[PDB]
DNA sequence: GCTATGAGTGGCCCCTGTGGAGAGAAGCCTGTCC
DNA sequence: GGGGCCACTCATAGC
RNA sequence: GGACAGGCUUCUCUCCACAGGUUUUAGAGCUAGAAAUAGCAAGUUAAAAUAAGGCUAGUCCGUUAUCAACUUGAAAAAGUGGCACCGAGUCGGUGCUU
């Protein structure tokens, strides 16, 4: 008798529940064979459990770091090119100069040439540093002076300019000598410069340096006169935030101003210093974060001026001037991609010739057009119905016609005397299109009634059905082409359809003017110069969903018509796109079926990866599938009858749906009208322009920045910045409310912090005005008020985010269809899939209601059994709905079961080698060198490697000064950086670490969260080489859970008042349960936790607060289970008492433990005794 | 009489800010079809 | 959030 | 249940760039004092690296994803574990079979 059974499943981002039930809703228990060398040959367990694993992580960090690596490599390349140019002349004056520069980072002892880099001797080096305190002084000297300087100084200037060439955010040239705004923008870049020089930036920096010196001297004198006691603190203590820290220490400028402001108020004669302090300009450094606004053209001008001045003495400079200028100016275009030779998975460049690509010959080697085409196409989707065909651009003329005709396909018109609404003829539709769609960018119902029915067809009153106040489709591309070309018959000619489609595709693909001009040069014979130039400026983005071959490429074998041909006119049928593709009277459906490529199916891994979502949900799907397969294997390979899955999606109010559906432009108009401001009056704007986030945020700001009281400029939004109210490190939120447009320097000044208190105070009134305007969300107000609320907190950083609930939805039906594919595969006599297994979807509301109605509450903070219980309830509810005392008793018995299978999936750690910060030199063996030849003692380096996994080693170690051999048995941690060498040859790596006579056969691969068992059932999981985590699970009787739930929401119960009072009475009567809960926690702790100090602290705190109100008792006790929870220990707050985490910092006890390897469900076990291995 | 050492406990530390270009998916809301 | 690290203290083992 | 059409919201992938920060070294510290130390002077810049490196030698690649254990496998992958009943503190006992 094949016992009928069903499987229930719950899927989350971190948990996967599984449950097996019979038709009587009982959970069967089976005896399972146990492998290994232990005595326990057979173990009985129940068929219920849940799997826990680490969350998946996105690739954003990897992409960012790859981009950074590429930037560093290319910058090094540019420096190498400059050195290549200079080598011939530099060798004649100083052969060792470049070696001195290259090895300058090394200590004195390891340097081969003389220690002073610039001149190799003390006198000239000192003289140079005295004459030129900053490199910008040297730059100005070279720009203005007309005398021949040393070549080495010229090299330093050129290299410094190249290595910090600045941004390319502005196109074209920005040299004032349109001129008025040019000079204004230059004054914006650099402020106040009286003398006319070709290097204004250097003059500005020198002026800043001199202001620094004068203010430093004045402050020194004032402090020494008035505050003698605090002089040493300000000028000697590097640990504080004073001037010493601002210079020698890591103190930021903001902290320096914060530390220095109160002292300035305490002294006289500090007025101007305070005024400059209000402008963030006192004692300001030169190399600062404000320089990010400097355009590269300024450095280009300075470079060109210096080269022009010195080219009269060194001919090679004059010959190579253009090369040097291009080195600064050249960059690889974004559509080109990396210049890889085929060996890179991220690259797509097509190379014309096998020469080495250089900045001087880039044009001759790289096919810009083909590269751009490949870049655009490889990310677009293929047509679903025609897999081998690319989709058309969303602005295609043919696609727009298709949309218009499809919308007009089902329009029904009712006139006087007509009994039923009527379909439009092909002639009628063509006339309507010609009369209105080619004349108006948007067509409304009123416009149609006035212009076509009443004027042309002469119908006085007409009733229109199926269209609401306007037709969705619009011929905007046609209007733009009519505006530009101004030749209507050229647009109307069908022989130009190929040419027009090619034009539209060209305009969609490319954004560089040069490429567009190059491609249109073939068609320049048909249009004048002005028309050709105008077309170069039009741009389109986006793509459609159907291919040209689908709409007007394939023809019906019987009539010769395409789908578009049918849509234009099909007689009384008036069949739409869906009807035509589902029409059995045409060959189109046969073409669809034939085009279905029965190609090599994606593997389970690949099929899961091809879904759209976070890779975490992909990992969840893969784990669920393997769980299902193993469960099927357990029951004798008999397929289950039913599978139940759960999603936690919660529906939303409709009126919110329509108010979102309203275009943002209308709601901005309403907000401005409530305000009454004239910003839209001065600058009217259209919704498709609001489609860009930049201009939309600018309008939301109403031209006024939240952070600084300053007027935004419409033409400067590109240079402007948007910064998140909450930094990305604390929490990731790209929502519009978190996004706020801000002045650039103000943004870059405020980093990794919430807005400061005083800015909030000064802009609070304006923020309330905005909130009354409703242009701002209350959530964004909450973000702006974090300083009042207390800033960032640990609790807000980690929590169950809403985004996981989004990840759960229809990706859950995706895993459902994946299971459907495998479970039902047999085809019947008619080649129809035989659905032997049903896929069931139920919403979490049903199960939550079942729980609330029948007192089966769940409290997540107690243990991990809740996932398994939810899966069991899902299965029960699904089976019941497709299909009382005995069932309810069975449910209560199941929910009270003490044995539940909880398994933590073992994972090999990967990722970064260690912490990214570099620490100063010190005498410790735990530092790792940044380079092969750089001694960590003399150079410092990285710290705290992340252990990939641990291995058990039995060998002998030469210990003591006597070098005597001693048999040892311990855990050795393999770093990720050493993983390759260890896996290449374990024996060699172990010998290198100092182990001798290693028994290779005893090596056991122990990944993270590996499980060990001890006496009395105490369990531990291997967290790393030297730290463990709690591995046991607390089983609590259900009545205590129910009592705790009731007490927790004592004043928050959601039920009938009589039921609320009954539950209150039940809570009052069973108050003695609290002591039982405490005693059970105490017993569990004394047995498996071993936290005697923490347990005594908790117990003492309990009796002290024994008289507190019951609800607070419940809130505190629920927090108390964090002591006994699975995983790493965590700190928690019990009333006002704080308990530190108890960390198990020694792993010696598990060397004599019983190692357990658990299957993906844990039903199979393999136990190995470690006491018998490596016996002394 | 001195030293090496294992063992534990308490507290602190964790690289960052952005600009531009494109593509895609998924939730809702309206209308039409299978 | 959580593993790593260092200063500090003590208790014991061996000589 | 699915697809196209219009509006809004949220997130994912790829590329091109900028500004920093950190680290070592160079920028003769002076005076009195054996030294401990005290006083004074100065403080802004610079070079190089920015995951160890790898061979496929590119102006490329190196932090995503995958993985219980045993056998066959380079890997992917394939195979490897009785049942029924009475019970229940992390699972026990009871009866048949290999």
Topology:
Blueprint: E1 5-11, E2 15-22, E3 29-36, E4 42-46, E5 48-52, H1 60-93, H2 97-102, H3 122-131, H4 135-144, H5 151-163, H6 179-189, H7 200-226, H8 231-236, H9 243-247, H10 253-265, H11 271-278, H12 296-310, H13 315-319, H14 321-329, H15 362-365, H16 368-377, H17 397-409, E6 412-415, E7 422-423, H18 426-437, H19 445-456, E8 462-465, H20 476-485, H21 488-492, H22 497-509, H23 513-520, H24 529-537, H25 548-553, H26 563-568, H27 577-581, H28 588-595, H29 604-609, H30 615-634, E9 642-647, H31 654-661, H32 664-675, H33 679-682, H34 687-690, H35 693-700, E10 721-724, E11 739-742, H36 744-749, H37 757-773, H38 778-784, H39 786-789, H40 794-797, H41 802-808, H42 811-823, E12 838-843, H43 844-853, H44 865-882, H45 885-895, E13 901-904, E14 928-929, H46 936-939, E15 941-942, E16 947-959, E17 964-975, H47 979-984, H48 986-992, E18 995-996, E19 1005-1006, E20 1010-1013, E21 1019-1022, E22 1028-1030, H49 1038-1048, H50 1057-1069, H51 1073-1089, H52 1092-1104, H53 1110-1120, E23 1132-1134, E24 1137-1139, E25 1154-1158, E26 1165-1169
Parallel strand pairs: 1-9, 3-26, 5-13, 9-12
Antiparallel strand pairs: 1-2, 2-5, 3-4, 6-7, 6-8, 10-11, 14-15, 16-17, 16-18, 16-19, 20-21, 20-25, 21-22, 23-24, 25-26
Helix pairs in contact: 1-5, 4-5, 4-7, 5-12, 12-14, 18-19, 23-24, 30-42, 49-53
The chain binds three DNA and RNA strands through strand 3, strand 4, helix 1, helix 2 and helix 3.
PDB class: immune system
Keywords: cas, SuperFi cas9, immune system
Assembly: tetrameric
